[PDB]
Amino acid sequence: GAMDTFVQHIKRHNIVLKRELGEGAFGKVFLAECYNLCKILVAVKTLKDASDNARKDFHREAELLTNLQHEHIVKFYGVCVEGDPLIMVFEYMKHGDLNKFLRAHGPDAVLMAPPTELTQSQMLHIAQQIAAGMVYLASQHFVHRDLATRNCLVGENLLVKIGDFGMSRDVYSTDYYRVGGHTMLPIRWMPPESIMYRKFTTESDVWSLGVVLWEIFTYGKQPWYQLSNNEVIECITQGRVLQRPRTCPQEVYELMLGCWQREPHMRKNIKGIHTLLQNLAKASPVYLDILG
Template identity: 40%
Template sequence: MVILPYMKHGDLRRFLIATRYGDIPMFVPHQSLLCFMIDIAAGMNYLSSQGFLHRDLAARNCMLGDDLRVSVADFGLSKKIYSSNYYRQKLAIRVPIKWLAVESLSESVYTTKSDVWSFGVTMWEIVSRGRTPYPGVHNHELLDLLLSGHRLTPPEECDQKLYKVMQSCWDKEPNRRPGFGELGETLKGLLSELPVLEASLEASYINQGLEAVSSVAASLEPQTDSGRRWENVYLPAPVAAAAARDEYVEEENGYLKSTV
């Protein structure tokens, strides 16, 4: 049995999408985006130190708590490594194609460094505010593109130093990719180069957006209990509709049945 805390604001991807769509725009400081990444790196560093592979790291599988801290979740594909430092998948299962490392796609091999690759894609998701990686590329086309050297391009407003960190996660040689501990320290270094943002101000920026969208939702839906507190309603109808746009239409939501 695994007992997890209740994460009031739901998954990180939906939160990020809500910052771009909806009637009430939300401003999330760049410092906050880096903090999200640092939290995920810390969680993955602990997971790997205990000998576990996540194998499904993505913004949709990271949860945002009431304190605006991010926790890694969804361990449905995770594996414990015992006698070796890798896991080879043999059975056909649904896997997140666009988040997988090139060696996982080509050789069905998973290591901590393949989780690092997925972390790089998750960083890209965070900076792009929840966009789907490799837009316009079908799952069956991805491996050939990666083998030929293609990688995700930097999102708009992405700092060049941060993009280089992402690129380091996508090195074709797993042993040349940084570990999660190193990634966390690198991201903290980038955060230290930015102006210090007071925690109260950071929370105000985000929570005002959440509260405003909650008010919109409350005005659109009848209340059966006037005293009910609105929870996890930062995703208004326009945001939900955005998930149906071509940008978000994926083969099985990014998963494809495979032996990888």
């Protein structure tokens, strides 16, 4: 509602730092315990001894994320500005990132162990949740710019939420390329206009969703894995498309092809993508036991 426009402020004594999860763009990331919020586990981002403009950006980021509230968007609880460091509060997703989850439930993982192989029904349930979250972001005129399974988070009962880590993860360093020798960009999830002209829109996010769908149906495999970064851009710019995954239905692959149109405004709309995925997920629901 309208109250979400105003940033929720949390008292310092209510945050109990437990584990240093890593380091990001503006500071450290921690696993913490938050009391009198509604105790719950939280993923917190810190900003230590920063300038007036950097603290201004922190409050600006807080003002953006406070209004960005949805069932399939990682919950932003608020900020703690009482002293240094400045704390940004998000929910802690126990099961971690979606890419790690997809790989843990892949045919190789089942064979190397025992976890259950991720079914087509479970794949459709994951797909419709990300599509629902993307529908919300488009309605709020927000361009994600980095939509990938590594940026999605898994909760309880196959619950999937979209996030943007902004944290240095060495395991995903190969998923970024220094475009023009200036910006680290996720080329394998990017359309031609984003790689060549750095144009990021709702339509460029649609292309990324098509690639996210490819990731889900391939058990978290890297798109264009057979190719080098140069060959990836060549295929994207020339009009070559990713292969149809074995576990992917023809309706879903044709939807992926609709996301992969060269012209940004010729791509399938997010509402239409979600409606189809929601209908197929309801036709093939999740009922089987999932083991890790």
